[PDB]
Design a protein around this ligand. Structure first.
Ligand SMILES: *C/C=C(C)/C=C/C=C(C)/C=C/C1=C(C)CCCC1(C)C
Ligand SMILES: [Cl-]
Length: 209
């Protein structure tokens, strides 16, 4: 099982999700889910073709992964913000916090020296602030909606919080960090997480609709 095989698997999974969401497509929600998995599909194909594998010191960094995350994770937060009924100002805070996490990870991965752990730490701090907004203010806000919408928000929120919290550990234990986990295992774990936090996320929304 090679890296390219794992990338192709993620590509196929994202593509199936993309077509499923487009078919089922309230247009805003369905269009967002197409963007979430559609962008990831492209990133995985590019990586499957061997494009964007950047050598850094003694590790290999996958640049398309971080461009993907920077564009798709704010769309996931946007989806959750619509469910919770955020005003346009609360959106700005959480999307700003999200972008800090994603940019810090991208920069830390691309830096060869130990300064990269300083960048990782900053993303960790901003992530804790993002979790606070999901579990607190956004949950208060979602409470004002129908019982079914509130229930859907809580289920997507917990899926999001629990799984997103695993990524920094995979990053740190993998090549970008202490380089303990091997690239193949590290990639396999992230392909699984990407698929669940995007396509699984999406199908839980379809089921409730
Ligand atoms: C579809 C892709 C998803 C949901 C990716 C999520 C990625 C994260 C939650 C990554 C978080 C990170 C930290 C909290 C600190 C810095 C390193 C990151 C980017 C792995
Ligand atoms: Cl990486």
């Amino acid at each position: 099982v090679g890296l390219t095989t794992l990338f192709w698997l993620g590509a196929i999974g994202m593509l199936v999700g993309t077509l499923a969401f487009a078919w089922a497509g309230e247009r805003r929600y369905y269009v967002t889910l197409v963007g979430i998995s559609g962008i990831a599909a492209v990133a995985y194909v590019v990586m499957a073709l061997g494009v964007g594998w950047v050598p850094v010191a003694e590790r290999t960094v996958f640049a398309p992964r971080y461009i993907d995350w920077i564009l798709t994770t704010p769309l996931i937060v946007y989806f959750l913000g619509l469910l919770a009924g955020l005003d346009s100002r609360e959106f700005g805070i959480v999307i700003t916090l999200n972008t800090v996490v994603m940019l810090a990870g991208f920069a830390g991965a691309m830096v060869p020296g130990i300064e990269r752990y300083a960048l990782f730490g900053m993303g960790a701090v901003a992530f804790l602030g993002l979790v606070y907004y999901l579990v607190g203010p956004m949950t208060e806000s979602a409470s004002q909606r129908s019982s079914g919408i509130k229930s859907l928000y809580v289920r997507l929120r917990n899926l999001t919080v629990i799984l997103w919290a695993i990524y920094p550990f995979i990053w740190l234990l993998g090549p970008p960090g202490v380089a303990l986990l091997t690239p193949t295992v590290d990639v396999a774990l992230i392909v699984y997480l990407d698929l669940v936090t995007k396509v699984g996320f999406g199908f839980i929304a379809l089921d409730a609709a």
